[PDB]
Design an enzyme around this catalytic site. Structure first.
Site, PDB file in Angstrom:
ATOM      1  N   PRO A 172     -23.601  16.680 -86.977  1.00 49.75           N
ATOM      2  CA  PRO A 172     -22.920  16.181 -85.199  1.00 49.75           C
ATOM      3  C   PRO A 172     -21.228  16.469 -85.647  1.00 49.75           C
ATOM      4  O   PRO A 172     -20.955  16.251 -87.030  1.00 49.75           O
ATOM      5  CB  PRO A 172     -22.930  14.545 -85.403  1.00 49.75           C
ATOM      6  CG  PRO A 172     -24.427  14.585 -86.206  1.00 49.75           C
ATOM      7  CD  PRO A 172     -24.516  15.255 -87.132  1.00 49.75           C
ATOM      8  N   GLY A 173     -20.358  16.933 -84.903  1.00 52.26           N
ATOM      9  CA  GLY A 173     -19.939  17.032 -84.826  1.00 52.26           C
ATOM     10  C   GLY A 173     -18.797  15.442 -84.326  1.00 52.26           C
ATOM     11  O   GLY A 173     -17.691  15.478 -83.969  1.00 52.26           O
ATOM     12  N   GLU A 174     -18.914  14.883 -84.994  1.00 51.20           N
ATOM     13  CA  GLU A 174     -18.532  13.204 -84.852  1.00 51.20           C
ATOM     14  C   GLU A 174     -18.018  12.892 -85.841  1.00 51.20           C
ATOM     15  O   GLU A 174     -18.483  12.309 -86.671  1.00 51.20           O
ATOM     16  CB  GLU A 174     -19.351  12.306 -83.335  1.00 51.20           C
ATOM     17  CG  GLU A 174     -19.069  13.399 -82.660  1.00 51.20           C
ATOM     18  CD  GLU A 174     -20.543  13.069 -81.745  1.00 51.20           C
ATOM     19  OE1 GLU A 174     -20.749  12.035 -80.946  1.00 51.20           O
ATOM     20  OE2 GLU A 174     -21.281  13.514 -81.042  1.00 51.20           O
ATOM     21  N   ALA A 175     -16.772  12.427 -85.898  1.00 52.39           N
ATOM     22  CA  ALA A 175     -16.280  11.766 -87.097  1.00 52.39           C
ATOM     23  C   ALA A 175     -17.274   9.701 -87.901  1.00 52.39           C
ATOM     24  O   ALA A 175     -17.685  10.216 -88.443  1.00 52.39           O
ATOM     25  CB  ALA A 175     -14.602  11.092 -87.868  1.00 52.39           C
TER      26      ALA A 175
ATOM     27  N   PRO B 232     -21.837  17.793 -79.425  1.00 51.69           N
ATOM     28  CA  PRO B 232     -22.994  16.860 -80.071  1.00 51.69           C
ATOM     29  C   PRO B 232     -22.829  15.669 -79.381  1.00 51.69           C
ATOM     30  O   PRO B 232     -22.960  15.853 -78.480  1.00 51.69           O
ATOM     31  CB  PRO B 232     -21.962  16.762 -81.818  1.00 51.69           C
ATOM     32  CG  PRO B 232     -21.230  16.689 -81.123  1.00 51.69           C
ATOM     33  CD  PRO B 232     -20.197  17.700 -79.825  1.00 51.69           C
TER      34      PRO B 232
END
Length: 203
Positions: free
Chosen positions: A103-106, A203
């Site tokens: 996912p494009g999330e830290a 995401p």
């Protein structure tokens, strides 16, 4: 590594449901598990591993990296089912990461890395002192993977093995990681970058 026979028989319905609406497919697994008195967490995790070729991988990654209790327990089961023993730390982290459509999330990526560090430790209590130590090693390795291979960075600015050892000082639950172990780790990531596949715009 197998699903309960009833889940196996209803796999088609579960897959179609999951792919159209993740929570619906999950509830179908949970309803059958309730009926046959089995733990759904492990069951859902097993399903993700077994029906990987038929699922919306982005949806799986998203579900597994979510903060909810059920999701977190599924992730724990999902990662513990992977083999991190008899395979170097780097090889293990590489494999774990390659499993997902990240996912494009830290925050989400962090939860996945945390799950890996926990599983790595449980399977290699002799390599690292605890989960936190494994997590620090994973974080450091990921930062190494990016920095050592950036083309726009002068070679002399890149972290050396010497630098890595200084940066991990006291990071093994107050103690240090074996120098040879870190030299090996540095050589693996330097010789073979991680294979990271991140999702798109949403995401």
């Amino acid at each position: 590594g197998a699903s309960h026979p009833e889940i196996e028989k209803a796999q088609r319905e579960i897959i179609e449901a999951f792919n159209a609406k993740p929570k619906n497919g999950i509830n179908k697994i949970k309803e059958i598990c309730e009926q046959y008195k089995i733990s759904p967490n492990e069951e859902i995790a097993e399903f993700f591993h077994q029906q990987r070729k038929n699922l919306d991988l982005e949806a799986v990654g998203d579900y597994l990296s979510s903060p909810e209790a059920e999701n977190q327990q599924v992730l724990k089961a999902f990662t513990s089912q992977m083999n991190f023993n008899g395979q170097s730390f780097v090889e293990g982290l590489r494999t774990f990461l390659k499993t997902f459509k990240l996912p494009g999330e830290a925050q989400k990526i962090d939860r996945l890395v945390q799950s890996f560090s926990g599983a790595y430790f449980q399977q290699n209590p002799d390599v690292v002192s605890n989960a936190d130590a494994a997590y620090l090693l994973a974080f450091q390795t990921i930062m190494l993977n990016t920095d050592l291979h950036n083309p726009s960075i002068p070679e002399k600015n890149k972290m050396t093995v010497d630098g890595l050892k200084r940066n991990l000082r006291g990071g093994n639950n107050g103690g240090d990681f074996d120098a040879k172990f870190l030299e090996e780790l540095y050589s693996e990531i330097k010789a073979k970058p991680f294979e990271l596949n991140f999702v798109k715009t949403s995401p």
